[PDB]
């Protein structure tokens, strides 16, 4: 005879992301090869890691200018892919389409200041701990911090560690959960010599072990 089958209830519908293929309608088509085409990228995070992009400081500029006032705090900016300073970044552009992330984030400092001006600076990262960031340039030494002087190089790279409770952290910082979300970076000027309009440009790229997890389509369409 013939095989008996049972038509299950609930299966068979169309789902936007089902893994089954369709039935061809026009066979025997051979397309010219696209071999040895320069500039082929297969992973978005590879492109994000390879090429850093600038940060957007206040007033809409990608450098921080030396300040001639008692506040040794050059500036602070939130470390979050949804922050105001990371708004014009490729990493944030990728991250807006995913729900969770985990890994390291790198920071690049480059001195476009004049050669005849020498100075000393430090950078300090503060995880979501104490209620107030250490605005004091000395209080931030107790954090995980680094020191660099523009006398051996004009480039200095600082890695931002991943510190949180769970394994994966949100990328889409919630309306609730006020107070410093997770992390801030503030940069101090230990000393400066004839640096009144000397510049300092900061750029951010993905770390070696960065990772994004859950693809969503969040925008308003």
């Amino acid at each position, epitope marked *: 005879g013939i095989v008996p089958v049972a038509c299950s209830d609930g299966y068979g519908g169309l789902v936007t992301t089902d893994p089954k293929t369709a039935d061809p309608v026009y066979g025997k088509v051979y397309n010219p090869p696209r071999t040895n085409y320069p500039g082929r990228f297969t992973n978005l995070l590879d492109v994000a890691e390879a090429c850093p992009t600038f940060l957007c400081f206040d007033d809409g500029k990608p450098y921080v200018v030396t300040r001639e006032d008692e506040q040794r705090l050059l500036a602070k900016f939130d470390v979050s892919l949804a922050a105001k300073h990371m708004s014009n970044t490729y990493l944030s552009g990728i991250a807006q389409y995913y729900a969770q992330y985990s890994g390291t984030i790198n920071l690049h400092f480059m001195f476009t200041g004049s050669t005849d001006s020498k100075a000393r600076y430090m950078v300090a990262y503060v995880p979501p701990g104490v209620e107030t960031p250490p605005d004091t340039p000395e209080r931030a030494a107790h954090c995980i911090h*680094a020191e660099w*002087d523009t006398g051996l190089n004009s480039k200095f790279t*600082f890695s931002i560690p991943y510190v949180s409770a769970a394994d994966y952290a949100y990328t889409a910082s919630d309306v609730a959960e006020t107070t410093n979300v997770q992390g801030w970076v503030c940069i101090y000027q230990i000393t400066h010599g004839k640096a009144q309009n000397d510049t300092l440009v900061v750029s951010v790229s993905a770390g070696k072990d960065f990772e994004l997890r859950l693809p969503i389509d969040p925008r308003t369409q």
Partner: nanobody
Amino acid sequence: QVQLQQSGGGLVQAGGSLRLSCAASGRAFGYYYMGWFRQAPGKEREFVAAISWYDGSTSYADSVKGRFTISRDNAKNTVDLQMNSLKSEDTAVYYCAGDRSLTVVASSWRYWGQGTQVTVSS
């Protein structure tokens, strides 16, 4: 615990070459700037070299510029100081150190090695 182990020191003639090795153990080898410091007898520790951890870079002191070579191996967690064109002023103990900081000061580097003795014979 970030631990640094130095090796490769010894006695060597002036004008020769010697290579020092810094074996490092820990989860933070890939985020730390690593450089070398030399402590002459009766003198304080002084920066002699440093290598970055992202692009690779290089930076040598003026007294050793054009004569030294510092290299890192991330896969083996080893940092080496390739030394050439020896002079008698280089007789000192060489200390491997690292931190997120890149400076010429020595007090700013949290982690230090036990040091190795390098003697230059004229």
